[PDB]
Amino acid sequence: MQIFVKTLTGKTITLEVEPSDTIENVKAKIQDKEGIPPDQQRLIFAGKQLEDXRTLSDYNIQKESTLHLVLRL
């Protein structure tokens, strides 16, 4: 799959992901591409905040889904 991550400005980035990828794995991919520590990342899907120890499948996130990246720290 691919998914879309929108910053606060609306700057879109595309991520290559797997259905069984954890939120930590997604945070780690955003760190690789944008240099933000996972610690400082808040990820939001359909107004819901995604939590570590859960998969994209757990939250029903499918191909071409859109996550909102917000800064926590």
Residue numbers in the entry: 1 to 73
Per the authors:
Previous work has shown that free ubiquitin consists of an ensemble of conformations, including the “bound-like” conformations seen in ubiquitin complexes, thus supporting conformational selection as the binding mechanism. We apply our framework to analyze the binding of the paradigmatic protein ubiquitin7 to its partner protein, the SH3c domain of CIN85.
Besides the peptide-flip mode, an independent and similarly slow motion in our simulations and Markov modeling involves the flexible C-terminal tail of ubiquitin. Unlike the extended C-terminal conformation, the compact conformation sterically obstructs binding of SH3c to ubiquitin. Consequently, the extended conformation of the C-terminus likely is the sought-after ubiquitin conformation selected for binding.
